[PDB]
Amino acid sequence: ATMTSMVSQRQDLFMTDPLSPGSMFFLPNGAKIFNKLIEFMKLQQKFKFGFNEVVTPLIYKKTLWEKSGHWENYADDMFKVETTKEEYGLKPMNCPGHCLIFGKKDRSYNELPLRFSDFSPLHRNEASGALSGLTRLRKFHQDDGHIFCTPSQVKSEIFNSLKLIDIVYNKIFPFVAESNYFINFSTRPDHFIGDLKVWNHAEQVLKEILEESGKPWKLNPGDGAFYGPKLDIMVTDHLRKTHQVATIQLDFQLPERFDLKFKDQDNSYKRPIMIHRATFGSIERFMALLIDSNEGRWPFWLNPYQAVIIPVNTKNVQQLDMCTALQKKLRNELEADDMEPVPLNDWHFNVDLDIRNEPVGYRIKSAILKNYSYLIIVGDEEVQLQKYNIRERDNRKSFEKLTMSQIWEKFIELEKNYK
Amino acid sequence: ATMTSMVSQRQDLFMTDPLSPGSMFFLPNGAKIFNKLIEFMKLQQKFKFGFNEVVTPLIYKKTLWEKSGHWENYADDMFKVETTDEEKEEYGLKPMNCPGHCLIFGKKDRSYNELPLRFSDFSPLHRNEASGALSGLTRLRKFHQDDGHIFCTPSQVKSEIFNSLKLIDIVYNKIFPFVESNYFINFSTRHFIGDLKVWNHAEQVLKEILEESGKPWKLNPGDGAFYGPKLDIMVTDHLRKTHQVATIQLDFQLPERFDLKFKDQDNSYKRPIMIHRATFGSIERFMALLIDSNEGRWPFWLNPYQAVIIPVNTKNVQQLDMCTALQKKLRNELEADDMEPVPLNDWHFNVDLDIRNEPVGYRIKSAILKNYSYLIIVGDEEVQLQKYNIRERDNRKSFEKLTMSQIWEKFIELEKNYK
Ligand SMILES: [Zn+2]
Ligand SMILES: [Zn+2]
């Protein structure tokens, strides 16, 4: 039994049905987690690193995949469909579409760097025994992106693109001069395409980046790719298992095969440099890694169960009213029979309430096994003192006596700073 | 419509390519509108009407659609996926999310206190029509429907319906005043499963709720051939055209056909009554309606271009600084070289800047052309008084001279009103 499957069983995160083999179901909780990760990524891309989200078509004509050469390339690794017969097929990747977007209009050097980002679902057909859990899948969401820029600025872009990664694995996340990840730098093979000039410019720029990075990097000379240099992000498990999550890969083949052009400052037509960018890699896979790392214990913001309120006596009126009040505040929800709707950027916390008639210790225990980030209990003392008893799960000495307000502000100041 | 296409051309909303007929290109501005509408509906369903978002797989075995009953009537325009060098069980693509949610409900044992249990699905849908039957935003192959379903005991039914109507009364009766009611309803009983007197009982409860409604309504033979009664919500067009924006279905067939059950307080298994719900319907279509009605006039909430700053003298440093100050301090963007992450719920505004060297009147030339919702101008008097000149979109005369913070607070208090 995998850790993933186990945590899913416990928290009701995921589902799998034979009617849809290899395709992942997301329950309301897995929903919350997924959507939250995606939201974080979106904010970071749009409001910091300058990416513009687009939504591309899921399926394309055979002729398109033939233009990119990914038709014969992906044979049984890609699904297919027939139309009323042109023989359409489903996109394993976002690349060709994002090339079309660039090609549809006349581009100028002043629009560059032009960066696109797409969260659209991706379907890949793999052997019935090849796919296991979230790591190897059929239908999987990936956060993609592409940078179209003049060579001069390439370095800068790479830098920024790495910074994002640095913020993800080395800052916002646990599990390991001393950093979380190292980098595999993949140089030119013996057989390649595209002029060697821009090739060496690229490679040199990269050598400079990694050199001044401070992060450790393996040279891995000569492996991949005929369309140009790669960078693989490597993070190691607490179990010592080494994982490649995201990859930054320059592509010289698509610009030439899709014939993309941009007006330069010298008023001549030059072909733009394309950069494949990923961070979370496979979102499902990323969630996998997170699961294996935290074994089901989520940071306060990502946690499907943010906190729980337990009254000492189920039949105690004071405690009941107090708890219900705090809940109603923390969840921040509006009645359905009402009219006025919910606004934007208003805070909402899950905050379940246990009304079960069992003993206090029982709800404590069960709620602990349930992973809740914060346990808030109300006894006689809590009632008389008009406060709440709150604790973090991962420490188990906190026990702060806090007012509704103070709690609200604490959770807000939590999701604001993440962690 | 050449309207939607015109607005798409001026605002850079949507793109189309021969290589993908039926699939719409969503790129950055149209994607902004899209994602924002979707976000609104999200918040509303989640923190108000008590819905849980889920993500179902795009691929399902033909066996599923068989067992559901869609493999017969709706298999006509449905799309199939082979992708098999061997069997080839003939997995079909999902035009609709109906069966998936039933799978989700039936997966785990449930009881009476888990109801009403409401899901929602924003997952992409592909329905294949004739090559010429395609209207650009009206009918596509690939589109996103808000969908959603409800599982509740009979006692809950009326309740769940009323609330489900309230949601509508938000979007139409309130939010969008495109034209004391903005809508009227329709009717049902068009191959069905079960007893005739049972379906007639459903028509009795639905007619009973419409009798208790207080809204205009009509009748019709052919709506919702199955699994039971229904209410079609029609909107009178800009000019003399009635459409159907959303549909509310009452389905007694699926619960019995998928063998769904729960445990009533008496500890006996009863068959749940499910309600198919929709509000936005097709988001491409709804978006089309919006485009036609508003012409590219979209309010400050939905607007891709939220505003523009005009430096009456473009070569003046004193004015420029006061401009960029407002820009940077408005969009609230962060440096790309920082390790500083973009927080959540932090406000952001598009608020472009025109440094083009021309007469100020020419930079005002296209503002209301590009359809900016506000026009901000900085002159000498604006620097001396340390404020900005704000001109309202639809107000040809009235303007306000406001400090930065006032523009901030103003915009925030605006987008919070869904203005
Ligand atoms: Zn790519
Ligand atoms: Zn349905």
Swiss-Prot record, chain A:
Acetylation keyword on record: no
Record GO cellular component, one term: mitochondrion
Keywords carried by this UniProt record: Aminoacyl-tRNA synthetase, ATP-binding, Ligase, Mitochondrion, Nucleotide-binding, Protein biosynthesis, Transit peptide
EC number: 6.1.1.3
InterPro entries, alphabetized: aa-tRNA-synt_IIb, aa-tRNA-synth_II, aa-tRNA-synth_II/BPL/LPL, Anticodon-bd, Anticodon-bd_dom_sf, Thr-tRNA-ligase_IIa, ThrRS_anticodon, ThrRS_core
GO biological process: mitochondrial threonyl-tRNA aminoacylation
GO molecular function: ATP binding; threonine-tRNA ligase activity
Major localisation: mitochondrion
Superkingdom as given in the UniProt entry: Eukaryota
Family: Belongs to the class-II aminoacyl-tRNA synthetase family.
Protein's name according to its UniProt entry: Threonine--tRNA ligase, mitochondrial
Organism: Saccharomyces cerevisiae (strain ATCC 204508 / S288c)
Lineage: Eukaryota, Fungi, Dikarya, Ascomycota, Saccharomycotina
